[PDB]
Design a protein around this ligand. Structure first.
Ligand SMILES: C=C(C)[C@@H]1[C@H]2OC(=O)[C@@H]1[C@]1(O)C[C@H]3O[C@]34C(=O)O[C@H]2[C@]14C
Lengths: 116, 52
C-alpha cells in the first residue's frame, strides 16, 4: 500500500505546469527520498538473502519508476529549450504512459506471483 | 547520501579501517559534493561572462 501510494504520488508531477521548475524537481526528489526511506524499512523483515524476492523486486520497480518520472522531467526541461514541438506532448504522453505501464506491471506481477 | 549512510551504519561493528563499501559511499558522496560545488562555481562566474 505505501509503495503504490508513493508511486501514484510521484505521478502527480505531470499535472504541474512545466515552467515551475522548483515545484516539479522538489516533488520528484522528495518522492525519491520517501521511497529510499521506505525501501530499507520493508527489507529488514526478512534475512539478508542474496536472491530477489517478490517484495524487493516490487520496491525496486517502484524506485526505478519514481527515478524514471524524475529523469523524464529532466529530459522535458532539457528539450523545452531545444525544440518545443517534442516537449509539448511529453506530459500528455506521460499522463497516459505511466499509469498504464504500472497497471500492466501490477497485473503481470500479481498474476505471475499468485499463480505460483 | 546522508540518510543511506545512517541506514548502512545501523548494521556493522565499529571497525577503524575503511571498508570497500565505505570507500564506495565516500566516493559517491565526494562526487555529489563536487557536482554541487561545481554548480556553485558556475553560479559565481555566471554574471561576469556567460560563456563559461
Ligand atoms: C524544493 C525545495 C523548495 C527544497 C528542497 O529541500 C528543502 O528544504 C525545500 C523544500 O521545499 C522543503 C523540504 O521538503 C523539501 C526537500 O527536502 O526537498 C525540497 C523541499 C520540498
Amino acid at each position: 500500500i505505501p509503495c503504490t501510494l508513493i508511486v501514484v504520488l510521484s505521478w502527480v508531477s505531470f499535472w504541474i505546469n512545466k515552467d515551475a521548475v522548483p515545484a516539479r524537481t522538489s516533488l520528484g526528489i522528495t518522492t525519491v527520498l520517501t521511497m529510499t526511506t521506505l525501501s530499507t524499512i520493508a527489507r529488514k523483515s526478512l534475512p539478508k538473502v542474496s536472491y530477489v524476492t517478490a517484495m524487493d523486486l516490487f520496491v525496486s520497480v517502484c524506485f526505478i519508476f519514481v527515478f524514471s518520472a524524475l529523469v523524464e522531467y529532466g529530459t522535458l526541461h532539457y528539450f523545452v529549450s531545444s525544440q518545443p514541438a517534442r516537449a509539448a506532448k511529453m506530459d500528455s504522453y506521460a499522463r497516459i504512459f505511466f499509469p498504464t505501464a504500472f497497471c500492466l506491471f501490477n497485473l503481470v506481477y500479481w498474476v505471475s506471483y499468485l499463480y505460483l | 547520501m546522508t540518510t543511506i549512510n545512517t541506514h548502512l551504519r545501523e548494521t556493522l561493528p565499529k571497525i577503524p579501517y575503511v571498508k570497500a563499501i565505505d570507500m564506495y559511499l565516500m566516493g559517491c558522496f565526494v562526487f555529489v559534493f563536487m557536482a554541487l560545488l561545481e554548480y556553485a562555481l558556475v553560479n559565481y562566474i555566471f554574471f561576469s561572462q556567460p560563456a563559461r
